[PDB]
Design a protein around this ligand. Structure first.
Ligand code: CLA
Ligand code: CLA
Ligand code: CLA
Ligand code: CLA
Ligand code: CLA
Ligand code: CLA
Ligand code: CLA
Ligand code: CLA
Ligand code: CLA
Ligand SMILES: CC1=C(C/C=C(\C)CCC[C@H](C)CCC[C@H](C)CCCC(C)C)C(=O)c2ccccc2C1=O
Ligand code: SF4
Ligand code: SF4
Lengths: 142, 73, 41, 739, 163, 80
């Protein structure tokens, strides 16, 4: 069960910085991350300095998506902690992205069907002949 | 006209200047011709090519300029 | 001694030994033979 | 604090040389690509890249220090031995006024002997602008027989220095406990290395002030001058020279310092006949330095409960705004060598430039003020060294922040507070640089436009509309009225650059006061602009190294990387290495502007020959109404002063023109690298490799083009090389034909 | 007479340049006594300068309206005259030396392609092998032509291309 | 956006995913030797085009190639 975003979640103790949180975050979108973080500890922020983190699930949020994938990968690095992602649009609609499979896209989950791929040797593509349409960047099969 | 008669004693002129930024010495420095105010020498080589083909009047130049404007339109 | 002779195959050897031989030879030829600009015949 | 070394930590053997790149396990496997060699070269000194053993890193650094000082001592010995064997030092010594210094004589091979300029003294050779003859004259040297022994001593000391390096690396390799003795390192550098050396050199200048001040400046031939040992021991001699001696050394025991006035004297200034300064002032200054740096090295608790350590002092400094500051800066320094190196190079280059500024207007030697060439040489040399040192400090700051940094134990609220507003500083300095560019460079555009439009009465000028500074003039006023008003015991002012009294030695004015007008105002604003832009580059490289607004995962990519990828429109020159790359160019620009200002001021409003009626300078005062326009720098300074560098093929100065053209060449050559990439070059190498494989002559090592980082490195290297070499050739061929 | 140039002895500008150089040398040669070192240095310099100007004018080298020597590089003008040494034989000498060098380097780089890790041999050379091959290449024109007729230098199109 | 493709030349090393900074591509069934995974691009609204996935892909020739397309707020990495 992919968990959905929950407002009114406490935040880690930190002073402030000058990264992100601009006009884009108010009228376009903002991204959210949540993760366990037991054993209240010290961590580093991708757009700031060092901060403390209580035990129990805690939630953060930033401006760009990579600003949270960096934290997910960090959490991989040291102690096995398992955060998640969230999307937000102007209408308030929320979308869950990472990890949809729940098993961290680097590992397969029981079964799905992927797109944007073709069974052809590297190269051996089509010459610019018969490619006058050019459809932006061709999938070569659609 | 000042070029066809004695093409050795004179030099070409390209266009004039209405720039208010020039000072009094500037108007006195860009006045090689003497028949008008500040001017600029003509380095296009158009006098020679226009006189070799045959031209000794400014009206003959106005005519061609109007003709070229018409063909452009 | 062995590792030293092996070390003596790198930049600090021919590339130094070479081009030292050559600079010396050219300088000596230009010193004994002062100013050539054309062959004897 | 104690000593802690290990016995035979690394056995001495020529094996590890047979495997280049052993220090990097990635390189030790083998050179399968031509990039292997360049990485071998670019990483041999990268001690913290070999392994994370900071003990081994500290040992490597403490050994490379001796490795450098050995070369330093062999260099000084080589200078002394050049002065000894082949030079006109005796001829110069018998007649310093007209004879010029020469210590290099070329070999007759292909006509290069023309470089042996006729300098007199019965000897011909290459003129030297290093300043060793004037430095040696202040030591009572009378003949060449002394420099031989001095060079012998220097070479023995250099051999012993390499010995000590090998000893402390392979026989007495210390531990981190000894290296991290900040208390001991300070109280022995500050007190011992500085105080003891200063006291020894002051005692030296005190007992060598006889020849220079009295005998050398009385027409006495150096052979006629009694040797220094004949001055030291005989009490009758030092009683005849200075009456303050032979008293009995009584005033120094009871501290009744009243009779010591013939050798510790405070005068200031110089005689327009003696050319140089006096040794008594330098002796008193060195005694002051010795006492000061010896007492200062005694303000730290080490063992016997006397004093206070550095950690307690750092802990007892906190304020309302920051709070809990200076928490782990002691560990900041004791942990990484890069932090200490960056902190040192920070003000090391700045103090080098300050030494340049204190040398050009205060020549601390005899018979060199008239030598208009040595001053420019040393001034520009030290300023470029200072610029490089400052840029290197900017680089090593980011180096520290990359490898040796973690805000957990070295945590400090000061550093994180600086980081938390790392963007407002950059934005405001951007705005300030825009201000200075529109307000210091646009003025030259306005002046050119006004001079071209035929309105000279509207151009900025000391005659049309004055824009000269007064604050610097008020500082010069406070220094001028300082004697007898705010400096009672003082005789003269700080320097003769603002106090009239045109001092001339043999026609050539040794010193004339320097004016400050609209031109100096504009040029100092240009200097501030360039320096602020350089600091902007360096600081924006240092801060945006751990994290940024675009790429958060920036620390893992390291310190030396060209980019991240052509994504988000394009990422290029984002690493701190690239910011140091650009800071090198900006330091070049700033230092070049400053040195051109120096040269042209000194040649227009300072230097010249004095006639019966006043002084006739080199140039006819072309500094007033030429600096106010960019064309002026090409009107009377660059165009005018370049005649010698291009007209010196007929004399021994042709090598200057050769270096001139070659530096132009290498500069454009650097442009080649700076404007190109690798794709084109790699594919061209591909086709060339095709051409090779047809005859089966290609190499086994895969020939690849240079790395992007190495491409930019070669670019900047050739660029600064060409620039500095061209400017060197110019300033060194122009100043010989005018002095 | 070729190209309007005249033999370099009959050039008034050439002799004027020689006199100019000698005057410029003597004006600062008169600064020193005949016993000191700089004087002997200038004496020897003048010696080999006069030798420059004397030895050039033999077997014929054309100087132009400027009096300076001008090399003739066409075979055929160096023939039918005496100019084969201006640049005709130096061409063959450089070709010989460059052959020599390339031959030795190629045979080295080939004989190293057989042992394990040849890359090492390119950063740690085989000094005795290089010395042996260095003293065996001065017949390379013989070995090159017949190694060409042999075919041991043409690779039978087994290399990496893209097209 | 950025048209990303994955050819049949692949071994399923799971490296171009533990290297992608934006978690764009997935790895779902493939019939391999020891790991048996193949990469796929189900979504591209967040792909910036950094070509970090092309550096870690050890396939010769590369299994993934980013066809550079048009830019957006996500594709330009704009926090504003
Ligand atoms: C915006 C200002 C302006 C404009 C609109 C023109 C326009 C023109 N110039 Mg001109 N020129 C200018 C400024 C300008 N000039 C200035 C500041 C100078 C330096 C004093 C010159 C010096 C110059 C010369 C020497 C010549 C022209 C000529 C010409 C005519 C040929 C086209 C050309 O050369 O393009 C513009 C050229 C540079 C922008 C053209 C109608 C040529 C001519 O004689 O006309 C037939 C000619 O030979 N110009
Ligand atoms: C390939 C490099 C090279 C070569 C071929 C030579 C060759 C020669 N050198 Mg020389 N030399 C060199 C490099 C070289 N040198 C270098 C790099 C230096 C700097 C240290 C010197 C310094 C030097 C000195 C000081 C002297 C020579 C001398 C000589 C000559 C003595 C041999 C002789 O006549 O015995 C017999 C030959 C056949 C029977 C000789 C022709 C001596 C000389 O000039 O000859 C009188 C001599 O005085 N050399
Ligand atoms: C392809 C370029 C090139 C060529 C063909 C030459 C050719 C020549 N140079 Mg030369 N030279 C060059 C580039 C070149 N140089 C460059 C770039 C420099 C700058 C460092 C020099 C600096 C230079 C000097 C200083 C001298 C020469 C001299 C000579 C002549 C001596 C021949 C000799 O040594 O006898 C035969 C050699 C072996 C049998 C010769 C014809 C010498 C000369 O002028 O004659 C006295 C001379 O002393 N060159
Ligand atoms: C400090 C670095 C340094 C530098 C850059 C030079 C540079 C030079 N030295 Mg020198 N030298 C030095 C240190 C140095 N020396 C020291 C420490 C000593 C004491 C042993 C000497 C003793 C010395 C002698 C005796 C001679 C030179 C000579 C020379 C010149 C000949 C070039 C040469 O073959 O050099 C050396 C090549 C490789 C090191 C040259 C410009 C020669 C000269 O100028 O002719 C008079 C000469 O004969 N040097
Ligand atoms: C850090 C201070 C300092 C420094 C840098 C120097 C530096 C120097 N001294 Mg000196 N000296 C000093 C302090 C200092 N001294 C003090 C305090 C005394 C009093 C004891 C002396 C007494 C002294 C004498 C008597 C002599 C020197 C000499 C020298 C010069 C050559 C020494 C030599 O040949 O090396 C070592 C030689 C090994 C074979 C040299 C430039 C010599 C000199 O040339 O006179 C100026 C000389 O004879 N010094
Ligand atoms: C830098 C270390 C140093 C050294 C090694 C010496 C060594 C010496 N000094 Mg000296 N001195 C020094 C510093 C030094 N001084 C300083 C800094 C001052 C300034 C206060 C003096 C002022 C001084 C005076 C006034 C005299 C000496 C004298 C002497 C000599 C005999 C007296 C004595 O033994 O003491 C002796 C060789 C005496 C002397 O010249 O011998 C006759 C003597 O009269 N010194
Ligand atoms: C005492 C002065 C000093 C010292 C000890 C070092 C030491 C070091 N520097 Mg550095 N540097 C300095 C001054 C200094 N630098 C200055 C003044 C500048 C400004 C021009 C630089 C600019 C600089 C750059 C741009 C880089 C280094 C780098 C390095 C490291 C590797 C150097 C190497 O082996 O590459 C090769 C040495 C010769 C080819 C090394 C630990 C490199 C690094 O990776 O940083 C860790 C790096 O890229 N330095
Ligand atoms: C002609 C060459 C040239 C010029 C004019 C500039 C100009 C400028 N550079 Mg640049 N730079 C150059 C070459 C040049 N650079 C080169 C070759 C490099 C490679 C090392 C760099 C690298 C570089 C860096 C890294 C940076 C700059 C920055 C800047 C700006 C600093 C702000 C300022 O007010 O300056 C002067 C302003 C002007 C000249 C504007 C003139 C406006 C005209 C006169 C008015 C016309 C209006 C008209 C009526 C319409 C500035 C506009 C800095 C920046 O972006 O700002 C902080 C910055 O960080 N430069
Ligand atoms: C591209 C190379 C080249 C060029 C441009 C020339 C050009 C020239 N050669 Mg030449 N030549 C060459 C290669 C070349 N040669 C070679 C490699 C050889 C060696 C076989 C000769 C041997 C040679 C001789 C023997 C003569 C010339 C002569 C000439 C000149 C008149 C042409 C001629 O022979 O009469 C007409 C051509 C009919 C086909 C002419 C300017 C002649 C000359 O000296 O001019 C008076 C002359 O007699 N050449
Ligand atoms: C030409 C060029 C190269 C190619 C650079 C090369 C090929 C440097 C190689 C030259 C060295 C000096 C080869 C010398 C090595 C010799 C084979 C052996 C040395 C000779 C001995 C006698 C020492 C780049 O890599 C590059 C990168 C980024 C921007 C622009 C450029 C660029 O313009
Ligand atoms: S280009 Fe960058 S963001 Fe896009 S799929 Fe590849 S690694 Fe991920
Ligand atoms: S990185 Fe390349 S080879 Fe590896 S799983 Fe991804 S597409 Fe396949």
């Amino acid at each position: 069960k992919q968990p959905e975003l929950d407002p009114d979640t406490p935040s880690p103790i930190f002073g402030g910085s000058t990264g992100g949180l601009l006009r884009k975050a108010q009228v376009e979108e903002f991204y959210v991350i949540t993760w366990e973080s037991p054993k209240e500890q010290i961590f580093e922020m991708p757009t700031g300095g060092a901060a403390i983190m209580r035990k129990g699930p805690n939630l953060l949020k930033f401006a760009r998506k990579e600003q949270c994938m960096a934290l997910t990968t960090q959490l991989r690095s040291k102690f096995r902690q398992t955060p998640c992602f969230y999307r937000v649009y102007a209408d308030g609609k929320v979308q869950y992205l990472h990890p949809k499979d729940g098993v961290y896209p680097e590992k397969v989950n029981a079964g799905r069907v992927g797109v944007n791929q073709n069974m052809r040797s590297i190269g051996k593509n089509v010459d610019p002949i018969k490619v006058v349409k050019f459809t932006g960047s061709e999938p070569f099969e659609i | 006209e000042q070029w066809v008669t004695d093409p050795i004693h004179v030099r070409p002129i390209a266009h004039a200047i209405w720039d208010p930024h020039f000072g009094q010495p500037a108007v006195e420095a860009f006045t090689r011709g003497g028949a008008s105010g500040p001017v600029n020498i003509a380095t296009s080589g158009v006098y020679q090519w226009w006189y070799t083909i045959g031209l000794r009047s400014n009206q003959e130049l106005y005519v061609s300029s109007v003709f070229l404007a018409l063909v452009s339109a | 001694m062995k590792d030293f002779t092996t070390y003596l195959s790198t930049a600090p050897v021919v590339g130094l030994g070479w081009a030292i031989f050559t600079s010396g030879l050219l300088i000596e030829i230009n010193r004994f033979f002062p100013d050539p600009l054309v062959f004897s015949f | 604090v104690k000593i802690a070394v290990d016995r035979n930590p690394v056995e001495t053997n020529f094996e590890k040389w047979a495997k280049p790149g052993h220090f990097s396990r990635a390189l030790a496997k083998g050179p399968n690509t031509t990039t292997w060699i360049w990485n071998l070269h670019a990483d041999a000194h990268d001690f913290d890249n070999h392994t994370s053993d900071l003990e081994e890193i500290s040992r490597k650094v403490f050994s490379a220090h001796f490795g450098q000082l050995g070369i330093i001592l062999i260099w000084l010995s080589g200078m002394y031995f050049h002065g000894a064997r082949f030079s006109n030092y005796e001829g110069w010594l018998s007649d310093p006024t007209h004879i010029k210094p020469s210590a290099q004589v070329v070999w007759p091979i292909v006509g290069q002997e023309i470089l042996n300029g006729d300098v007199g003294g019965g000897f011909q050779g290459i003129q030297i602008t290093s300043g060793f003859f004037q430095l040696w004259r202040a030591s009572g040297i009378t003949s060449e027989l002394q420099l031989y022994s001095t060079a012998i001593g220097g070479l023995v000391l250099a051999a012993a220095c390499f010995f000590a390096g090998w000893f402390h690396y392979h026989k007495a390799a210390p531990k981190l406990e000894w290296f991290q003795n900040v208390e001991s390192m300070l109280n022995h550098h500050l007190a011992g290395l500085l105080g003891l050396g200063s006291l020894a050199w002051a005692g030296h200048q005190i007992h060598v002030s006889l020849p220079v001040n009295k005998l050398l400046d009385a027409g006495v031939d150096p052979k006629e001058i009694p040797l220094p040992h004949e001055f030291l021991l005989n009490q009758s001699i030092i009683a005849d020279l200075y009456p303050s001696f032979s008293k009995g050394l009584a005033p120094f025991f009871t501290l009744n310092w009243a009779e010591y006035s013939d050798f510790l004297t405070f005068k200031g200034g110089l005689n327009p006949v003696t050319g140089g300064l006096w040794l008594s002032d330098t002796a008193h200054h060195h005694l002051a330095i010795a006492v000061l740096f010896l007492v200062a090295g005694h303000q730290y608790r080490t063992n016997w409960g006397i004093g206070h350590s550095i950690k307690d002092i750092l802990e007892s400094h906190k304020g309302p705004f920051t709070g809990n500051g200076h928490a782990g800066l002691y560990e900041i320094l004791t942990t990484s060598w890069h932090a200490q190196l960056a902190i040192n190079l920070a003000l090391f280059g700045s103090l080098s430039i300050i030494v340049a500024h204190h040398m050009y207007a205060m020549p601390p030697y005899p018979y060199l003020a008239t030598d208009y060439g040595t001053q420019l040489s040393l001034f520009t040399h030290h300023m470029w060294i200072g610029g490089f040192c400052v840029v290197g400090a900017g680089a090593h700051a980011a180096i520290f922040m990359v490898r040796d940094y973690d805000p957990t134990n070295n945590y400090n609220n000061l550093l994180d507070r600086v980081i938390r507003h790392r963007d407002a500083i950059i934005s405001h300095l951007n705005w300030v640089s825009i201000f200075l560019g529109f307000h210091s460079f646009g003025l030259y555009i306005h002046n050119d436009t006004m001079s071209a439009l035929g309105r000279p009465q509207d151009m900025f000028s000391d005659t049309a509309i004055q824009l000269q500074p007064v604050f610097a003039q008020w500082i010069q006023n406070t220094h001028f009225t300082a004697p007898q008003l705010t400096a009672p015991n003082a005789l003269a002012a700080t320097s003769l650059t603002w106090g009239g009294d045109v001092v001339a030695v043999g026609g050539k004015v040794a010193m004339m006061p320097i004016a400050l007008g609209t031109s100096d105002f504009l040029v100092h604003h240009i200097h501030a602009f360039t320096i602020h832009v350089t600091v902007l580059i360096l600081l924006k490289g240092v801060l945006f190294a751990r994290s940024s607004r675009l790429i958060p995962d920036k620390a893992n990519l390291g310190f030396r990387f060209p980019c991240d990828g052509p994504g988000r429109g394009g990422t290029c020159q984002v690493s701190a290495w690239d910011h140091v790359f650009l800071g090198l160019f900006w330091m070049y620009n700033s230092l070049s502007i400053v040195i051109f200002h120096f040269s042209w001021k000194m040649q227009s409003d300072v230097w010249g020959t004095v006639t019966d009626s006043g002084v006739s300078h080199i140039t006819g005062g072309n500094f007033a109404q030429s600096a106010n326009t960019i064309n002026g720098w090409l009107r009377d300074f660059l165009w005018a002063q370049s005649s010698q560098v291009i007209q010196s093929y007929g004399s021994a100065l042709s090598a200057y023109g050769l270096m001139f053209l070659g530096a132009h060449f290498v500069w454009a050559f650097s442009l080649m690298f700076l404007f190109s990439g690798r794709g084109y070059w790699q594919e061209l190498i591909e086709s060339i490799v095709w051409a090779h494989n047809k005859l089966r002559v290609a190499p086994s090592i895969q020939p690849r083009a240079l790395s992007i980082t190495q491409g930019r490195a070669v670019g900047v290297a050739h660029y600064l090389l060409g620039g500095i070499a061209t400017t060197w050739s110019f300033f060194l061929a122009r100043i010989i034909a005018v002095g | 007479d070729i190209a309007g140039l005249t033999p370099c002895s009959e050039s008034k500008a050439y002799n004027k340049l020689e006199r100019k150089e000698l005057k410029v040398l003597d004006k600062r040669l008169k600064q020193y006594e005949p016993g000191s070192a700089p004087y002997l240095a200038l004496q020897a310099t003048k010696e080999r300068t006069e030798n420059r100007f004397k030895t050039y004018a033999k077997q014929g080298l054309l100087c132009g309206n400027d009096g300076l020597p001008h090399l003739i590089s066409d075979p055929g003008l160096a023939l039918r005259f005496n100019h084969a040494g201006e640049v005709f034989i130096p061409t063959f000498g450089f070709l010989y030396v460059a052959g020599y060098i390339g031959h030795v380097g190629r045979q080295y780089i080939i004989l190293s392609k057989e042992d394990a890790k040849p890359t090492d041999k390119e950063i740690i050379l085989d000094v005795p092998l290089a010395l042996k091959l260095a003293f065996q290449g001065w017949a390379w024109p013989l070995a090159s032509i017949q190694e060409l007729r042999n075919g041991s230098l043409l690779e039978k199109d087994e290399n990496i291309t893209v097209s | 956006a950025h048209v990303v493709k994955i050819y049949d030349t692949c071994i399923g090393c799971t490296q171009c995913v533990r290297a992608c900074p934006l978690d764009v591509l997935e790895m779902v069934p493939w019939d391999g030797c020891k790991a048996a995974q193949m990469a796929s691009s189900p979504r591209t609204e967040d792909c910036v085009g950094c070509k970090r996935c092309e550096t870690a892909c050890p396939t010769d020739f590369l299994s993934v190639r980013v066809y550079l397309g048009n830019e957006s707020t996500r594709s330009l990495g704009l926090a504003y």
